[PDB]
């Protein structure tokens, strides 16, 4: 029985949101694990299952409720309940298969999606690229009623990977990256919705790398630079993990800690 | 379980092409690209593509190559115009996925040398 993370859009605030986001970082890192100053998540192989996952219950205005599930290891959503029925992507590996039977395990109704939680698949079922998707409290609103209704038969597949890609940025990619937090919390403290831009986009797409070379490091000099690109869509490169430190508030497990 | 393979002297000015294509584990197969490295210089992003049609390019190739992506056989075309002997490098194709994150896996082509001139 997971821990449970509450959030609701209903008069939503940059301080609730700030707190939410805070809570969710804390409960998916022990802390045990820092290196140059970026926590990072647990590893999976050895992680018994019973602290694999975290919820994370969201709310509306309209009363509308849907959980999500976290992986501690990815702090991705690997699945949703609404009501009585759950659904969960397309997990990569065998073992994932497994691990994913022991969310939501009182409803009825289980499904597999016969796609992954991954963006290029994402943006093809939604007919739009992320840059094309507006981020912030009004769309976040949205994206909760949508998937709620999907379990009603009221949500098309398009409206819901749309949906999909706003949760999944407006709350896992905001605990992956302090700079995407803050990029969510100028929205609502402004009340707006924008999609993101090249500096959002690409760091999503390059948190992996990031993690390896930045923990396959020389004291924090990367072995090889990451490609990222500035507000304008301007490319540019990172070497060195001091300069990232405000940017990236977690990591995956890449290699062991060098002692 | 993900494998790459590269097929395509050329002269100055001339045009080339160059393929990538992708088997196995690549349900959640995300973006494909070119990498370069002249000897002793360093790896440069030149171009990719994401299955979803989001397209980037190097500063230094942008009007010259074309990255093309057939989802259909998940394979990746570079179609190069107006070489310069500044583009004499081993080329380096790379895909990234994972279902829980872009770049889960990152893996790299065995590479392809181009000389102009
Ligand atoms: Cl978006």
Redesign the pocket.
Known sequence: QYPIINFTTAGATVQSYTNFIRAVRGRLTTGADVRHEIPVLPNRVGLPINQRFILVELSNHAELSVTLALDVTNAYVVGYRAGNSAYFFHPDNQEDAEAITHLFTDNQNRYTFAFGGNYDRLEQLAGNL??????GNGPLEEAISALYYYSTGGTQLPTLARSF??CI?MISEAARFQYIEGEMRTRIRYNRRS??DPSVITLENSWGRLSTAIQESNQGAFASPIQLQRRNGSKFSVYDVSILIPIIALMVYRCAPPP | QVQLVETGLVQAGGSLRLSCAASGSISSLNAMGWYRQAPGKERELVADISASGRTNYADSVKGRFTISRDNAKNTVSLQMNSLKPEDTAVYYCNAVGGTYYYDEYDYWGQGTQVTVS
Do not use: G, K, V, Y
């Open positions: 992320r840059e094309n998707i507006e981020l890609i706003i940025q999609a993101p």
